């Protein structure tokens, strides 16, 4: 099941232009490279997640680019303030094909515990987003699972090839969500360790 | 009426000489307690009956002297715990005249708190546990106050 933009269409994948498609995919979700662009505390907790304790280099997602052109991917890690929304329209706009955005945090998710004058109630009032993280902060693996979870999303997209020929229109594959997926494990759960040890 | 000692039983039966003394005349008839009765258990029968005989009205009465029954029981058993002399003081001082909506409360306190300042041993040998009110709730580390 994917959805198209140029609907909710069916999967449009010859063998070769499926493992060329693959190829691809395969090429840009492991090539991921996140604009630095910081907001709030939450991008605190992005760039710890980018030191040597955790490492996210590993992913190969760690270049960091200063420039909107060069980066694939914005992570919109901090509270959507009203005089910021304009700058953050204008950065992603600046963004080329392909680019993804991640909410990284409650603000940037809903606007959190700012339901305040000043605060735009969630990023996705205004610029798609791809996958979200609840916390405030997520922390650094918080961060690193959502990457993983963009990088799966990205796998098994469609996009052309070329511009030149062949359909070009974007084909966005909808997910299983996680909360379903984990509801088989997650209610299983009968003791935890009692709060006062460490 | 409050519990008087051998010393006070050179005393003229009127109002006025028994008021001086700490208690009071009443009725005038006068019941004598051997060296054999256990204070603590004389003055939980006397508080037993005291406050089965409230008539309910008045929260000090109504709610207090069962309180005081029961730590008077729990000191017949040895089951007393520090801080009960001083709640049955404190309903000493809180159930007296004009607390209560009527007389039977102060007239239930004064035997109670005559025998605690005459016999303050014998409620003192009751006390042997030490107090607890909570258990251990499994999770949680209770605020340890000192
Ligand atoms: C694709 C070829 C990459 C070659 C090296 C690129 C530059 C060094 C790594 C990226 C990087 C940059 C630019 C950087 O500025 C930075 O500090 C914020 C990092 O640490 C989190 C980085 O990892
Ligand atoms: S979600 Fe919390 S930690 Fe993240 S930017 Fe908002 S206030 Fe800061
Ligand atoms: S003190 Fe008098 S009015 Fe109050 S509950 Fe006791 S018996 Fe009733």
């Given at each position: 099941?994917?959805?198209?933009?140029?609907?909710?269409?069916?999967?449009?994948?010859?063998?070769?232009?499926?493992?060329?498609?693959?190829?691809?995919?395969?090429?840009?979700?492991?090539?991921?490279?996140?604009?630095?662009?910081?907001?709030?505390?939450?991008?605190?907790?992005?760039?710890?997640?980018?030191?040597?304790?955790?490492?996210?280099?590993?992913?190969?997602?760690?270049?960091?680019?200063?420039?909107?052109?060069?980066?694939?991917?914005?992570?919109?890690?901090?509270?959507?303030?009203?005089?910021?929304?304009?700058?953050?329209?204008?950065?992603?706009?600046?963004?080329?094909?392909?680019?993804?955005?991640?909410?990284?945090?409650?603000?940037?998710?809903?606007?959190?515990?700012?339901?305040?004058?000043?605060?735009?109630?969630?990023?996705?009032?205004?610029?798609?987003?791809?996958?979200?993280?609840?916390?405030?902060?997520?922390?650094?693996?918080?961060?690193?699972?959502?990457?993983?979870?963009?990088?799966?999303?990205?796998?098994?997209?469609?996009?052309?090839?070329?511009?030149?020929?062949?359909?070009?229109?974007?084909?966005?594959?909808?997910?299983?969500?996680?909360?379903?997926?984990?509801?088989?494990?997650?209610?299983?759960?009968?003791?935890?360790?009692?709060?006062?040890?460490? | 009426?409050?519990?008087?000692?051998?010393?006070?039983?050179?005393?003229?039966?009127?109002?006025?000489?028994?008021?001086?003394?700490?208690?009071?005349?009443?009725?005038?008839?006068?019941?004598?307690?051997?060296?054999?009765?256990?204070?603590?258990?004389?003055?939980?029968?006397?508080?037993?009956?005291?406050?089965?005989?409230?008539?309910?009205?008045?929260?000090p009465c109504?709610?207090?002297?069962?309180?005081?029954?029961?730590?008077?029981?729990?000191?017949?058993?040895?089951?007393?715990?520090?801080?009960?002399?001083?709640?049955?003081?404190?309903?000493?001082?809180?159930l007296?005249?004009?607390?209560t909506?009527?007389?039977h409360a102060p007239?239930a306190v004064?035997?109670?708190?005559?025998?605690?300042?005459?016999?303050?041993?014998?409620?003192?040998?009751?006390?042997?546990?030490?107090?607890?009110?909570?258990?251990?709730?499994?999770?949680?580390?209770?605020?340890?106050?000192?």
């Amino acid at each position: 099941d994917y959805t198209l933009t140029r609907e909710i269409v069916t999967d449009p994948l010859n063998v070769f232009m499926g493992k060329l498609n693959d190829m691809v995919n395969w090429g840009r979700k492991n090539s991921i490279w996140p604009y630095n662009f910081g907001l709030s505390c939450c991008y605190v907790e992005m760039v710890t997640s980018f030191t040597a304790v955790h490492d996210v280099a590993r992913f190969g997602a760690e270049v960091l680019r200063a420039s909107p052109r060069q980066a694939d991917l914005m992570v919109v890690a901090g509270t959507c303030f009203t005089k910021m929304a304009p700058v953050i329209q204008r950065l992603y706009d600046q963004m080329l094909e392909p680019k993804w955005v991640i909410s990284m945090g409650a603000c940037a998710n809903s606007g959190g515990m700012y339901d305040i004058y000043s605060v735009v109630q969630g990023v996705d009032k205004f610029i798609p987003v791809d996958v979200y993280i609840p916390g405030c902060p997520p922390r650094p693996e918080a961060y690193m699972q959502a990457l993983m979870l963009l990088q799966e999303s990205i796998g098994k997209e469609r996009r052309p090839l070329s511009w030149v020929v062949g359909d070009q229109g974007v084909y966005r594959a909808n997910m299983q969500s996680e909360r379903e997926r984990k509801r088989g494990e997650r209610i299983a759960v009968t003791n935890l360790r009692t709060p006062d040890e460490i | 009426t409050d519990f008087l000692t051998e010393a006070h039983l050179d005393l003229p039966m009127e109002f006025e000489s028994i008021g001086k003394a700490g208690s009071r005349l009443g009725t005038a008839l006068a019941m004598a307690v051997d060296h054999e009765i256990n204070m603590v258990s004389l003055v939980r029968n006397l508080e037993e009956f005291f406050a089965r005989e409230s008539c309910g009205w008045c929260t000090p009465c109504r709610d207090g002297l069962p309180w005081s029954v029961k730590i008077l029981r729990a000191l017949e058993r040895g089951e007393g715990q520090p801080g009960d002399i001083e709640t049955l003081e404190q309903l000493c001082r809180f159930l007296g005249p004009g607390k209560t909506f009527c007389a039977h409360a102060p007239g239930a306190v004064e035997p109670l708190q005559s025998a605690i300042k005459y016999f303050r041993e014998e409620f003192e040998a009751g006390i042997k546990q030490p107090f607890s009110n909570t258990h251990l709730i499994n999770g949680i580390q209770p605020n340890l106050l000192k």
